[PDB]
Amino acid sequence: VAAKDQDLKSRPESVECIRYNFRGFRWLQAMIFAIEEINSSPALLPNLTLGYRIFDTCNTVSKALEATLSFVAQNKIDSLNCSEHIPSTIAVVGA
Amino acid sequence: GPDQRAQKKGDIILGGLFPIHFGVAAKDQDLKSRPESVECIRYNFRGFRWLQAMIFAIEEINSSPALLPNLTLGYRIFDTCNTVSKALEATLSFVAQNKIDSLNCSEHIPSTIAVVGATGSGVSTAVANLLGLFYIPQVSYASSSRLLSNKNQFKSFLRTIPNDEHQATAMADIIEYFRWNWVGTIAADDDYGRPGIEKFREEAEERDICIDFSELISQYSDEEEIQHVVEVIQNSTAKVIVVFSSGPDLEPLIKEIVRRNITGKIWLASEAWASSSLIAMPQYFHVVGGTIGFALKAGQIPGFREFLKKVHPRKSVHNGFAKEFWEETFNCHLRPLCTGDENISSVETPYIDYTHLRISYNVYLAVYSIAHALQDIYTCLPGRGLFTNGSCADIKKVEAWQVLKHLRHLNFTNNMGEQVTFDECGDLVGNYSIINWHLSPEDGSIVFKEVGYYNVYAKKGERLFINEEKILWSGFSREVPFSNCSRDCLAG
Numbered sequence: 001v002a003a004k005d006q007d008l009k010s011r012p013e014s015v016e017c018i019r020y021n022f023r024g025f026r027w028l029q030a031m032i033f034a035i036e037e038i039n040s041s042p043a044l045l046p047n048l049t050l051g052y053r054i055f056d057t058c059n060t061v062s063k064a065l066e067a068t069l070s071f072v073a074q075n076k077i078d079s080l081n082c083s084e085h086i087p088s089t090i091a092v093v094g095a
Numbered sequence: 096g097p098d099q100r101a102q103k104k105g106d107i108i109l110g111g112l113f114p115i116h117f118g119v120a121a122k123d124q125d126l127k128s129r130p131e132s133v134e135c136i137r138y139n140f141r142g143f144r145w146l147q148a149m150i151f152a153i154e155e156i157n158s159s160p161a162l163l164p165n166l167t168l169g170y171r172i173f174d175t176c177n178t179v180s181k182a183l184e185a186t187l188s189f190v191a192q193n194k195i196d197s198l199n200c201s202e203h204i205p206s207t208i209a210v211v212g213a214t215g216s217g218v219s220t221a222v223a224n225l226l227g228l229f230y231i232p233q234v235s236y237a238s239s240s241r242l243l244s245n246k247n248q249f250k251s252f253l254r255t256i257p258n259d260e261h262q263a264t265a266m267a268d269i270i271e272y273f274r275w276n277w278v279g280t281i282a283a284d285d286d287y288g289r290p291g292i293e294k295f296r297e298e299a300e301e302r303d304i305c306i307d308f309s310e311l312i313s314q315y316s317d318e319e320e321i322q323h324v325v326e327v328i329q330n331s332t333a334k335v336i337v338v339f340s341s342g343p344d345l346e347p348l349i350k351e352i353v354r355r356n357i358t359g360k361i362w363l364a365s366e367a368w369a370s371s372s373l374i375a376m377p378q379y380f381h382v383v384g385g386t387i388g389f390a391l392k393a394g395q396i397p398g399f400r401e402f403l404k405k406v407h408p409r410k411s412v413h414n415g416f417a418k419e420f421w422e423e424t425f426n427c428h429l430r431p432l433c434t435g436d437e438n439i440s441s442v443e444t445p446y447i448d449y450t451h452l453r454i455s456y457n458v459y460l461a462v463y464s465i466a467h468a469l470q471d472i473y474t475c476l477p478g479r480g481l482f483t484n485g486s487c488a489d490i491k492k493v494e495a496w497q498v499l500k501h502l503r504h505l506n507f508t509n510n511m512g513e514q515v516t517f518d519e520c521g522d523l524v525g526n527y528s529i530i531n532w533h534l535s536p537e538d539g540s541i542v543f544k545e546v547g548y549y550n551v552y553a554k555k556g557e558r559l560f561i562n563e564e565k566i567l568w569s570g571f572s573r574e575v576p577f578s579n580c581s582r583d584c585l586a587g
């Protein structure tokens with residue numbers, strides 16, 4: 001991330017990721033490739049399609065925690081406490 | 096959110112995390128059925144006293160016109176049970192409004208402005224990640240791991256308890272003072288034990304001290320690991336053992352050592368178990384007697400004991416923890432049926448039986464630090480301010496990050512006449528008190544006698560003072576033991 005130190009004189013804003021990791025992009029493409037191959041292959045899990053929601057971590061705990069909070073939204077609503085548009089995540093790959 | 100809480104509404108809401116229990120049940124999850132909730136078992140009267148200290152501080156602030164007039168503080172306090180999962184449920188409860196603002200329905204959701212907690216360092220680490228996600232200040236009273244001094248990962252963490260670096264240096268100084276060079280080390284396999292024991296290893300390497308063994312223990316350790324550690328201790332010829340562990344995490348090992356009746360070992364304790372009731376009971380004085388340990392500076396809270404004695408399972412409606420406290424204290428159920436008429440003085444528990452207030456004073460100071468930050472928010476001249484164009488934050492519409500900014504620039508005065516500030520790492524500096532474990536001649540319990548101190552404000556090599564005339568090695572002997580690997584070579 002961008003090491004722009006915040007003095008908290010204004011409302012803090014989301015940090016910015018700086019350098020591009022091509023290897024991580026290749027790993028993400030590997031995940032997508034595996035999912036598509038599974039969907040096409042009828043031998044494994046027929047009549048069923050696997051989806052995905054993949055985020056960025058930038059080797060930072062905060063970004064991965066925001067993504068994880070997005071992952072557990074429905075379970076969070078069930079435990080702590082509306083719309084059913086929230087998709088339940090069966091498993092997470094990472095980090 | 097979780098139940099059994101302690102809630103009271105006010106204009107501004109503070110969060111709280113305290114160990115009302117020692118730990119959760121160890122029922123394994125076979126996962127053949129849907130996982131249920133986990134149950135906490137052992138009741139911690141000391142953590143309940145700390146919770147009462149926070150509530151007492153809040154009530155004292157709410158009664159004083161000198162601090163935050165026309166504003167009422169509130170509190171929403173939960174139990175952690177020394178477990179990350181319970182604390183994370185409570186923290187998810189804390190940040191519901193901010194979390195739903197970031198990710199994305201009732202407006203009644205109370206917004207926590209600051210959190211007080213927690214005791215452990217792993218628990219504080221998890222809660223600190225979650226709270227620093229939203230810049231909610233978190234002032235802890237007992238977490239002392241150096242890993243929490245990293246501000247790149249923990250943006251909003253503050254402490255009223257000193258760091259553990261000076262304590263490891265103090266242990267090295269003590270070992271050097273009594274001319275030992277052949278020692279052993281034990282630590283808890285957590286974020287508190289490992290950094291401290293590594294710092295001690297570095298200091299001992301600098302002071303020409305050899306270490307025979309280095310073992311790691313946990314409160315969930317199986318039998319195999321316990322016997323491995325015990326055999327490691329038993330084979331070693333070193334009599335001095337340095338322990339960085341808490342009371343709950345050290346109990347199985349001490350029990351197993353007592354079973355085999357292993358004697359003659361000098362125990363150097365850290366602040367976590369140097370005053371712990373799970374290690375300091377008179378059925379182990381043949382093993383842990385003569386323990387040399389550390390303690391924090393005490394504090395004076397006038398009127399705290401009287402408030403502690405006003406606990407009642409019916410009158411105290413804001414504290415949902417009073418019912419179980421009464422049931423455990425009197426062993427009744429509301430087991431004889433409770434009547435709500437007895438005296439807390441009748442039963443001897445860590446709730447009222449205490450001599451100094453050290454962690455409780457830490458909770459007191461944390462609450463007052465947040466209060467003084469809010470006060471500085473209130474008494475803010477429009478010309479000069481810490482935010483953009485030197486403005487001032489609206490006290491009626493105060494946000495958590497503004498409280499964080501004021502806490503980063505905080506300088507106030509205690510009730511005892513001392514200046515309270517936080518450094519760049521949000522840490523606070525304090526003395527240390529050396530104590531030794533003696534046997535009580537009358538009651539038969541374990542007495543903590545001060546035998547010296549550690550002056551952190553002095554220069555290196557002059558910070559330690561010990562009066563060995565007051566020490567009783569193994570509890571009875573006045574002869575300093577011998578803990579060198581080899582006998583000194585004579586002349587020629």
Ligand SMILES: *[C@@H]1O[C@H](CO)[C@@H](O[C@@H]2O[C@H](CO)[C@@H](O)[C@H](O)[C@H]2NC(C)=O)[C@H](O)[C@H]1NC(C)=O
Pocket residue numbers: 271274275276303577579582583
């Ligand atoms: C145990 O070993 C230590 C070595 O660290 C001994 O301490 C040294 O004692 C000599 C004797 O005069 C001093 O000159 C050194 O300065 C000491 N070194 C220290 C204190 O670090 C100690 O005497 C030994 N104890 C016994 C009982 O033999």
Ligand SMILES: *[C@@H]1O[C@H](CO)[C@@H](O[C@@H]2O[C@H](CO)[C@@H](O)[C@H](O)[C@H]2NC(C)=O)[C@H](O)[C@H]1NC(C)=O
Pocket residue numbers: 525526548549550551552
């Ligand atoms: C830590 O302990 C030392 C020693 O007890 C304190 O230093 C003493 O301070 C008092 C006044 O508070 C002086 O009268 C003594 O002469 C000091 N003794 C020394 C310097 O050896 C020190 O103030 C304590 N630190 C605190 C309370 O923060």
Ligand SMILES: O=C(O)[C@@H]1Cc2c([nH]c3ccccc23)CN1
Pocket residue numbers: 214215216217237238239240287341366367368454
């Ligand atoms: O960081 C930690 O885990 C320890 C826990 C701890 C300390 N002092 C205590 C007294 C009683 C109970 C627990 C503790 C020091 N900080």
Ligand SMILES: *[C@@H]1O[C@H](CO)[C@@H](O)[C@H](O)[C@H]1NC(C)=O
Pocket residue numbers: 323326327330
């Ligand atoms: C301690 O010594 C005995 C005797 O040689 C040995 O059997 C045992 O394994 C040793 N313990 C450890 C932990 O090495």
Ligand SMILES: *[C@@H]1O[C@H](CO)[C@@H](O)[C@H](O)[C@H]1NC(C)=O
Pocket residue numbers: 356358381
């Ligand atoms: C433990 O060993 C000590 C040392 O001799 C002895 O005095 C004590 O009676 C022993 N206790 C038990 C229960 O064996």
Ligand SMILES: *[C@@H]1O[C@H](CO)[C@@H](O)[C@H](O)[C@H]1NC(C)=O
Pocket residue numbers: 506507514516
């Ligand atoms: C805090 O204020 C006191 C005055 O009460 C002053 O003596 C001290 O130097 C100040 N400390 C800091 C760190 O600003």
Ligand SMILES: [Ca+2]
Pocket residue numbers: 113114175176177178213214215218
């Ligand atoms: Ca805890």
Ligand SMILES: [Ca+2]
Pocket residue numbers: 141342370371372373
């Ligand atoms: Ca205790």
